[PDB]
């Protein structure tokens, strides 16, 4: 995926 | 060289923050569920639990000299609780975005918070928790803040912008900026605690841990031992080792002289997110928080 924002 | 023993393991919702109390046999854990817990790992009894919020609580530290815990959460708030009575001490909006990390000054009444709002902020509990300074310059989420234990008028921030900045309290511009070459950004920064080496260490999504000399502003070593994002890497206070943890589910103990992995531990709690070491090296205790709970280990 293009983005993996850090939410976990 | 290491006789590692499992002291206590507890299953829970994802543990995002963890810290040891310096004089009581306790760890604090902060959970993705919004709950925070205090455990006695020697008797294996929960001392206290608080449902702080419904959002994740990513950051938590003891302020033992005040009988407090301080926590930071995704609802933008810093909250402080007295651990003896459970009473909330203060509750304020600290940043307009997630709080990733909190550090507590060892002698002055100051706390630093690092945020997705691109800043670090300094709060003074002897001025009614006033915002005393905002440190600006980072260009992505600030993931980790740490005072230099040998010089706590200075501190480091690690950032997804691929830099570590070292700052001086009372000064608006960084002392310097280290470009880590960790192209996926920095998740964590930690200082070596002893005077024999002016070293810091960074952990990255790029699978690497890097050791930096903060005087020469140079990279001493790159340590690659994980298969997924490295959540943290820290120097142990009393043993010549580094401990890292990863979304690959492992903890690794590295020899701090040879930079080799000496032990790989799978505690079976899935992904690793956070780390703490007992501040005076009592039983050489370390503790790590994971998707499925936390574990406290003694090293011999």
Residue numbers in the entry:
A (entry chain P): 1 to 8
B (entry chain A): 2 to 301
Q: What does the published report state?
A:
COPI mediates retrograde trafficking from the Golgi to the endoplasmic reticulum (ER) and within the Golgi stack, sorting transmembrane proteins bearing C-terminal KKxx or KxKxx motifs. The heptameric COPI complex (α/β/β'/γ/δ/ε/ζ) is recruited en bloc onto Golgi membranes (Hara-Kuge et al., 1994) but can be divided conceptually into two subcomplexes. The α/β'/ε B-subcomplex has been likened to clathrin because α-COP, β'-COP, and clathrin contain N-terminal WD-repeat (also referred to as β-propeller) domains and C-terminal α-solenoid domains and because recent studies have suggested that β'-COP, like clathrin, can form trimers. We demonstrate that N-terminal WD-repeat domains of α- and β'-COP directly bind dilysine motifs and establish the molecular bases for the interactions using X-ray crystallography, structure-directed mutagenesis, and isothermal titration calorimetry (ITC).
